[PDB]
Amino acid sequence: IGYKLGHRRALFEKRKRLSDYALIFGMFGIVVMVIETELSWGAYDKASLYSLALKCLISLSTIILLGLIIVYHAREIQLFMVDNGADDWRIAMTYERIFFICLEILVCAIHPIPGNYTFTWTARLAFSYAPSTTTADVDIILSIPMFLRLYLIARVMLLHSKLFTDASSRSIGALNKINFNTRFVMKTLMTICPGTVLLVFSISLWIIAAWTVRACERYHDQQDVTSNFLGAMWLISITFLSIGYGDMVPNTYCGKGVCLLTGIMGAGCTALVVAVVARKLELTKAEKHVHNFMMDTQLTKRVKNAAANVLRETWLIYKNTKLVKKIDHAKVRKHQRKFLQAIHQLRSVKMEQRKLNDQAN
Amino acid sequence: IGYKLGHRRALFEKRKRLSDYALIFGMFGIVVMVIETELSWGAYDKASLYSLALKCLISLSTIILLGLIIVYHAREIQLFMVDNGADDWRIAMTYERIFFICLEILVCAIHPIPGNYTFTWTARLAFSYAPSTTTADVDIILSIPMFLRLYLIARVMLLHSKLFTDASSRSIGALNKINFNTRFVMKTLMTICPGTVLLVFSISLWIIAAWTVRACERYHDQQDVTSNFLGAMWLISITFLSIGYGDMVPNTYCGKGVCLLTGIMGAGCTALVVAVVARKLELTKAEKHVHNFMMDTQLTKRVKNAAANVLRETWLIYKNTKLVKKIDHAKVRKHQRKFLQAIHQLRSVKMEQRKLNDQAN
Amino acid sequence: IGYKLGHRRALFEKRKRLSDYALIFGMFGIVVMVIETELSWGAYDKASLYSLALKCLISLSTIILLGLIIVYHAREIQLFMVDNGADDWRIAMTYERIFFICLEILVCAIHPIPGNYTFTWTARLAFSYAPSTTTADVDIILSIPMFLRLYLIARVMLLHSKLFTDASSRSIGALNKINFNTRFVMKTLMTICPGTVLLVFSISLWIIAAWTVRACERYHDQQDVTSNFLGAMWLISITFLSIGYGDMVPNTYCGKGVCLLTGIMGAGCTALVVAVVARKLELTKAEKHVHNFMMDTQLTKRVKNAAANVLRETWLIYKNTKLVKKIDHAKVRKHQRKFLQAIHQLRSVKMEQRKLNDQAN
Amino acid sequence: IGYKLGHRRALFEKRKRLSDYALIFGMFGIVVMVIETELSWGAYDKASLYSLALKCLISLSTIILLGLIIVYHAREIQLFMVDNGADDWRIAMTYERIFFICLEILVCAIHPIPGNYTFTWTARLAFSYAPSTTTADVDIILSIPMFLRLYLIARVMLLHSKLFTDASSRSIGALNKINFNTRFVMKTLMTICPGTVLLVFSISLWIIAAWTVRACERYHDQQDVTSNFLGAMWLISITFLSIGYGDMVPNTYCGKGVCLLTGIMGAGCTALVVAVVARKLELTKAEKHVHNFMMDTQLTKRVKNAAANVLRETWLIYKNTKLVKKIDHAKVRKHQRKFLQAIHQLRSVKMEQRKLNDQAN
Amino acid sequence: QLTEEQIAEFKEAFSLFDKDGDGTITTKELGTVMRSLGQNPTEAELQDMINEVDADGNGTIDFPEFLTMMARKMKDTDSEEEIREAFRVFDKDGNGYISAAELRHVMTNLGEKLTDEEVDEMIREADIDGDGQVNYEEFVQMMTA
Amino acid sequence: QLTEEQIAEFKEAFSLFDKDGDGTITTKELGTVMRSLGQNPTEAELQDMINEVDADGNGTIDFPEFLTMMARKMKDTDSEEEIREAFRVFDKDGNGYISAAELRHVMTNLGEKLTDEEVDEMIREADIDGDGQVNYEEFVQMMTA
Amino acid sequence: QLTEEQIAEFKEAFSLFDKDGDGTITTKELGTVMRSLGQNPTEAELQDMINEVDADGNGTIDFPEFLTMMARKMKDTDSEEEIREAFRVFDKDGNGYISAAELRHVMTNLGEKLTDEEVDEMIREADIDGDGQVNYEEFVQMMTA
Amino acid sequence: QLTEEQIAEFKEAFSLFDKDGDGTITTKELGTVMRSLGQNPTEAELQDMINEVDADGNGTIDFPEFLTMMARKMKDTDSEEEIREAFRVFDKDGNGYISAAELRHVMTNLGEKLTDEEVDEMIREADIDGDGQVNYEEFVQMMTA
Ligand SMILES: O=C1Nc2c(ccc(Cl)c2Cl)/C1=N\O
Ligand SMILES: [Ca+2]
Ligand SMILES: [Ca+2]
Ligand SMILES: [Ca+2]
Ligand SMILES: [Ca+2]
Ligand SMILES: [Ca+2]
Ligand SMILES: [Ca+2]
Ligand SMILES: [Ca+2]
Ligand SMILES: [Ca+2]
Ligand SMILES: [K+]
Numbered sequence A, B, C, D: 001i002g003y004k005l006g007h008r009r010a011l012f013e014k015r016k017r018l019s020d021y022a023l024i025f026g027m028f029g030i031v032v033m034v035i036e037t038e039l040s041w042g043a044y045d046k047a048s049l050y051s052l053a054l055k056c057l058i059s060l061s062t063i064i065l066l067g068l069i070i071v072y073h074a075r076e077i078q079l080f081m082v083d084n085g086a087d088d089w090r091i092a093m094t095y096e097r098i099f100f101i102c103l104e105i106l107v108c109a110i111h112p113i114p115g116n117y118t119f120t121w122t123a124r125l126a127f128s129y130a131p132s133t134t135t136a137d138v139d140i141i142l143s144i145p146m147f148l149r150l151y152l153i154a155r156v157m158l159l160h161s162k163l164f165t166d167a168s169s170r171s172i173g174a175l176n177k178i179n180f181n182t183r184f185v186m187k188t189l190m191t192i193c194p195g196t197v198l199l200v201f202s203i204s205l206w207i208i209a210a211w212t213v214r215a216c217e218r219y220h221d222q223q224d225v226t227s228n229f230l231g232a233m234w235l236i237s238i239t240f241l242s243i244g245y246g247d248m249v250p251n252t253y254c255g256k257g258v259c260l261l262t263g264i265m266g267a268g269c270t271a272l273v274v275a276v277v278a279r280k281l282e283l284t285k286a287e288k289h290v291h292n293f294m295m296d297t298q299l300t301k302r303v304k305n306a307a308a309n310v311l312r313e314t315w316l317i318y319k320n321t322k323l324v325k326k327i328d329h330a331k332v333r334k335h336q337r338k339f340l341q342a343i344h345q346l347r348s349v350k351m352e353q354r355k356l357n358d359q360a361n
Numbered sequence E, F, G, H: 001q002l003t004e005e006q007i008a009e010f011k012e013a014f015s016l017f018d019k020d021g022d023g024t025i026t027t028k029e030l031g032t033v034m035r036s037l038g039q040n041p042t043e044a045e046l047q048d049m050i051n052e053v054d055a056d057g058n059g060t061i062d063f064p065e066f067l068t069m070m071a072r073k074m075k076d077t078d079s080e081e082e083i084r085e086a087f088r089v090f091d092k093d094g095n096g097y098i099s100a101a102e103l104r105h106v107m108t109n110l111g112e113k114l115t116d117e118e119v120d121e122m123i124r125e126a127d128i129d130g131d132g133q134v135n136y137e138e139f140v141q142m143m144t145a
């Protein structure tokens, strides 16, 4: 048993390290892509040697990333053989697993290849419906889908989770037959720290979406509107919130697609955030008990005051009616009005007391 | 006995087949209408013979569809006679069956009749408030209402349902007096598969609404804005989400009506989808039990740590106050601050434990 | 006694009739105002005699309406004297009854007085920020507030209610100290028929607000945009739904105020309508029981099928491993993959059955 | 003892008075800033002596405010020493107390210093994308963040609260370990008076944000659009409600930031308000009981009527089929249709009755 | 005539109630199913439901009896069951008979207010009246035959 | 004077309480109605409510007694019932009387305090029997005649 | 091989069930943990769970027995437990055996229809003993060995 | 000193627990309040809470004892109460004494990992009586007052 558990733990450690390295190399590729995209518009041309150097560096990172993913899946299959008592790796090779491995390699293989390739881009300007033709480099079509590499963050998050790796958690969850997967960890995080999860997701989406909007829009924007980073940030914020475009309509279908994706994400994230805030503005059960106690005390005091006023006004009416030789009708009318007011106050305060006793159950 | 039940089963099978044929012919008519609408703007004119051929084919499909609907309603009345022990078919006609049959025939009778009829169409352009006069063919006013034939999908969905026709389901539902109608099947689908139902409905509405928007807008659009299919899809998506209109405002009241209908549908579909997502992000009862158990374990550990720190600082304050010949006030103050911090940590962790014990039941 | 109840019933009938007459005359005044506003822009000028005739008719209706309001309040004070054992009517006047009577008379006294009075109106056009100066008649400022007379509808609705007048309802409501006021009747209506109440309110608000927008906007609109009734209807619908203005921004602060009021009303009415729809898409308790029963039956069938497949694949693996003369590795691998699939299906169906047994409580 | 618990009360009173004075001086500074900002655009220039007088008055108020803040924190530290049995004030400094004291001094120290300093401001106009260069005074950058002083309102609200200082409330809350802080008082207010809290917050935000938008936009607005106070009020209202922008789009990033903050606030405040309204439209438990009772009575009457109709038509079909010399078959068919109608009515009313009995418990 | 598949479907529906496999439905099985459906009945109600459909008199539901009652339950609505329900609406006592005075009151006041001559003719034509106590047999025979 | 329709409406309101045709509301029908209305009144409270309305002392409310009660219940508010409620606020433990010291304490400390001249002058004016403990009869007799 | 940290992790996981320091998990402790986990296991079920893990039949789970079962439980899924579950699906009663007729019915009717000759071969090979009732040991030995 | 208004405020706070007219808070007038506050304390817990405040014995809290404890409850947080709570965290047995081995374990293993010499010095200084079972009195006296 000592060797059997140690082998699985060593395989877990190797697989976790491979995930960490894959995330490091994917993020390195994304960062160098962002730097090269920003700098080739300005500092250097696409025929410069700086462009070649940075894109060759991107391609080397991509090769290492693909190797790391393949070795990670080899370790996954080896762990599968260890777990499900198998001696042939070909048992693990279902159609679903092959398809997902191929999808992962396809997603992580897209990058701007070294070279100088251009294409013709035609778009209709917003609010003026005028055409715009530019000769755009192909590298933008290959750079934008590099943001799909962020699933490696989810992989690392699952593999570094304490729930997924702890022995106590596994032993307890075996009793309830809990399925320890990425969905369970995500739902647990949305349960304990919903505001933090939504905040991190929203800020990262905001920056990524604004940058990709300006990267797409800079080709047909010669007026510094949607190619402005701060303007793109504002556009993403107001489509997220569904206030709407101002004069900030994208000129390109890439920008429109990003804005649509932002609006779809916002339609749900806003409601989730509002539910979180509504829950956080609610009193705790102990605080509810204390508040009900203090309110009931105040209601009792007000009931006593109202009843005292009722009796006082009844006495005053009787006195000024059948006790004074000169019956002043104005005084009697005033006291009768006050008597009716006191009756109404007593009725209303008793209704409030009844409602509070209802919610106190 | 063994004859009446078989007779009812045969009648139901005939009704089901008639519904299938009616749906097939209605969808055939809609598809040929879409093809002819797309092709008469481009390839051939309205005086061409391809237009005549396709519209005559539409009219023949419509005649067969009307015949199929009439025979279907005859089978309905015959099954009604079988069920409610009636010998005269005139008992079925109740001023509501007649009205719904007439409505169904009216809805399924609208189609672009063969011929070359044109009318004058005047619309005010968006954002510029300029008039636009075109001579439009009448066939658009007769083509757009053909999408009303999609209730046959609901009819087929009811008739192919397992709940509607199954001895076990009817026998169980007779104990609760369940009414097995289209509303019940729709509610059951919205309970079992809400996301799938909403997704299918939204995608179909998206494509249909975008196509009808461009079909109406192509007459007064000479700038490729709302007559663009992809632009119409974007417009429908952003009015569904209530982000707004960009520069994409319909020039026609047909487009405005479609956008209003899309906005009304979106206002409810979005909220339903968000409720579905919120429910799907929630932990299962077993997962809740496991999570509460693990959180309580961590809370106990943290309580023990906090109490240990409290006792440690209580000891060190005394040890550095007394028990030392030369009292260093800086260190004593540091340990008193740490003692206060430990007290606060103990209080906070105990109140977290109290909250968790409250939600644990 | 048989006299006090009859006297109160007679007073109730008199108040009810006075409310009916007040509503009739208020609605007559509003209708004649709408007709005169529509016709003075076109058919006849403000200095003609048709305008004088219609406005004198409005003023006579207003005088009769004020008389009816005063007599209604006299009957209310008389019934107050009857109820609260009072002999002096001056007890009724409580600085709040006087204020509400004065407010009611002020609201019902505003109307376009006969005459030809004009004022200068300056507004900044939308989207172009160009000034517009017109000489407008004062009658618009006096016509628009006439829509405030619709509180008489609420008064009539309360006085015609069964809950407020029925003896059985009062007898049972006195046991729970229920306050039979307009708020209670409105809440009861929103509980019984929420969709109908919201639909009627929304349609009436739509038409009234669209007409008000048109009446205010026709002065500074010479392009048939917001002075179009159908365009105003669309504008009200898209600000109600918070999609936003298209190119339909009002040129006047009256239109902007109407649109803001429509948006505020829509922000709440939309959410209420969505809650109604969500409740109406929910299964009844009996339907829930039937659905859970049928789903549990299907789950049992699927559990049995999955377990049968598990045993079948176990047997097939054993046979092709230790019963055939030469072992075919491809066949054994295929059966081992199928065995693992069967195990996964059994686990998933059992957890579905467990979830259903959880929600069945 | 009498010394303590009275010394603490005296310290409480001194601290409360210091908070009151700090709020008075902060609000005085804000009001004079608003007056000077309004008047320097018009009446007098920035090189005038009225400007110098008002800004020197602002600076004197700021000095007194900083002194009051420092003395308040000295009283806080003294009360801390009294409570946590400390003799050295250095125990109170925990880098968090220091950080928050520094934050308060930084926030309250920002004000438009006397002088005539100008800077160059360049902004891109909305909807036209044209540049605008103005020489703006530095005082706007120093005036706008003066609205951050409104946290003193929260401080005063906590210190004047009954829950915080009442002996009965603290004695009761000590049995539930209730933490009496600003969050608890805010949650209590949101539980007692949610509509009033939201209304006050929304109106104050509306006016403050509209004035801030006007103050920022008046520099690049020469068309009276967003520098109009009433137009700014409308803009804030329609971004709060997420209807959108009309032609009212800020030319400055200050205005865009204010509009974004308004939209974020509105996205949550609107949902909270709608929840409040939905709760306030719900019947009380006693009202629910009364309503269920009355509805059950009406449904019993309707059940009796439906059953009587069923029996009546069952009799009439027999009487017109048999017991007659000649059969018309037309009246017989009519009565059979009415019999089926009565059966359906009885079924539906019984369904309503059982649904009501389900919601009755 | 029913096919093999239809007979199989109806046998499965029968098995939903015949858990033990005896080939017959007892009272306890029906009670368990109904309580699973959240309709907790009494022994009297369960016995009444078991009766009114068991033609062989064995006191338990057979398979042919189940087919006979499913012939009615598969319909959207049934006339005899609803006439029995309307009868039980006014048979609040539970004796199974309706007094002539109560029936006349119901027919003249509750529904469409039949004329007194019509009510007299109806009460005379009620053969199961038994000199006043109109039974459920007359109501069924009025419409069924 | 009441018409036939009014008498019919009040009769059906009475029938809403008189389940049994005893011609009078028993003391258990009121309990059943109140429990249907989400309350749990006690036997003492039920007896107190069934009293104060019956003038024949039978312990059961008739139809004329119901009409007299409805004469007050149909109003928006009733003065006598509310004076009784204000009396019961200070009548702890159902004593039925308030001591002069307790009444003076109530009228001087809580609520809008009276001047010491009117205090104990109220008690001197009240307590016609001279017992010294103010009963519910005196409070009713003040406002009424 | 296990390290000190891994041994400590497994020891604390054991302590989650070992309340007292007895060094062994009894039935009551497992019951308390499971009831904390929102279940209501029976004494028979708790005894069954204590069995199948107890290497040395002390009647209670030891630490090495806990480590041995954790070896299986740390995996995503276990074959033997699921084969036992599939066995218990068709074992309606508490007997540890299934009749040959029942197995033939199961394998020919429900699930993937196995060939009748294949079913005969399976029922012959599985029944290692002369008894025609197949035990759980045979099913486990079919796959494990 | 205290103003008469402050004395009145504290008196009404005392009246929130002292419902009866006496001048002592009993063990049941505290249980009623704590059960109104959503807690379910036992007789032992109530007795301990009374005993922690009850000077001069009598088994009941007086008014001056209430003032003395309010002097501690009015502040944001106390120190002696939290030291007692930290002590009770490790006094799971309830005997009121912590063994020297238990203190060494809880101070070396969990927390901030005191040095062995520091733990020895602390356990020697705490054991003033030399018994070796550290009581709550020693912990309170360590922090002085
Ligand atoms: O998950 C499990 N943990 C268990 C089990 C059975 C016995 C024991 Cl002692 C423990 Cl700790 C379990 N299931 O067999
Ligand atoms: Ca059976
Ligand atoms: Ca039978
Ligand atoms: Ca009675
Ligand atoms: Ca009587
Ligand atoms: Ca143990
Ligand atoms: Ca053992
Ligand atoms: Ca006492
Ligand atoms: Ca004492
Ligand atoms: K919106």
Ligand SMILES: [K+]
Pocket (backbone or CB within 6 Å): A242, A243, A244, B242, B243, B244, C242, C243, C244, D242, D243, D244
């Ligand atoms: K919008």
